[PDB]
Scaffold this active site. Sequence first.
Site, mmCIF file in Angstrom:
data_model
loop_
_atom_site.group_PDB
_atom_site.id
_atom_site.type_symbol
_atom_site.label_atom_id
_atom_site.label_comp_id
_atom_site.label_asym_id
_atom_site.label_seq_id
_atom_site.Cartn_x
_atom_site.Cartn_y
_atom_site.Cartn_z
ATOM 1 C CE1 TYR A 82 -121.657 -20.293 26.602
ATOM 2 C CE2 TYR A 82 -120.971 -22.452 25.764
ATOM 3 C CZ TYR A 82 -121.042 -21.527 26.808
ATOM 4 O OH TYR A 82 -120.510 -21.785 28.063
ATOM 5 N N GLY B 202 -117.250 -15.756 19.026
ATOM 6 C CA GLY B 202 -118.046 -15.305 20.156
ATOM 7 C C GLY B 202 -117.729 -16.008 21.461
ATOM 8 C CE1 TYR C 17 -119.258 -15.953 28.678
ATOM 9 C CE2 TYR C 17 -118.623 -18.261 28.692
ATOM 10 C CZ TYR C 17 -119.562 -17.265 28.925
ATOM 11 O OH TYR C 17 -120.795 -17.609 29.433
ATOM 12 C CG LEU D 262 -130.972 -8.331 29.683
ATOM 13 C CD1 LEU D 262 -129.942 -8.855 28.672
ATOM 14 C CD2 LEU D 262 -131.796 -9.481 30.221
ATOM 15 C CD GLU E 197 -127.240 1.312 28.416
ATOM 16 O OE1 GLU E 197 -126.483 2.255 28.000
ATOM 17 O OE2 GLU E 197 -128.491 1.466 28.481
ATOM 18 C CD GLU F 97 -121.649 -20.375 30.994
ATOM 19 O OE1 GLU F 97 -121.309 -21.466 31.478
ATOM 20 O OE2 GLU F 97 -121.376 -20.051 29.825
ATOM 21 N NE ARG G 47 -122.387 -24.365 28.560
ATOM 22 C CZ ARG G 47 -122.216 -25.496 27.877
ATOM 23 N NH1 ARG G 47 -123.041 -25.828 26.894
ATOM 24 N NH2 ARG G 47 -121.197 -26.315 28.173
#
Length: 168
Positions: free
Chosen positions: A65, A106, A108, A124, A126, A157, A160
């Site tokens: 993360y 931070g 979700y 991404l 942007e 994510e 992971r």
Amino acid sequence: YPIINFTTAGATVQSYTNFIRAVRGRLTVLPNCVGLPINQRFILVELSNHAELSVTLALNVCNAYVVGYRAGNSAYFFHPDNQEDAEAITHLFTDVQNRYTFAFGGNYDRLEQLAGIELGNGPLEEAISALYYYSTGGTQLPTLARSFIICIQMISEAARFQYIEGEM
């Protein structure tokens, strides 16, 4: 810390996959980071887009993360979840002139809340500008949040997930 680079400019499914493998190749998924010397507790992910704007995300190696990031001469950090992390992030982007720690976390749930979300190379691209311009007053908090979400889903994510399916 080790620096993984990735650009949305001329991005391929392949360039993106290798990017994620690289991240995954540096994770050490454990309940929480401890014992790991702060020297190797983070991965730095430098992102750049078509406008050649670049931001560097700081990823925690234990859970992948995003703990904060750097845009040029400023760095921002999510409110650390405790004291160990609080002191840990002080080791990140040390030559940076401006340091700021948000009062919110931070996760979700918080980002969803602050955001008031298509994924892909376009988003991404942007999201990277949003993260960058935040440091100069051009990005509103809701957009910053939506941008964090995009970075987190497409990078943290993604690594992971692959790490886990990697453990079968």
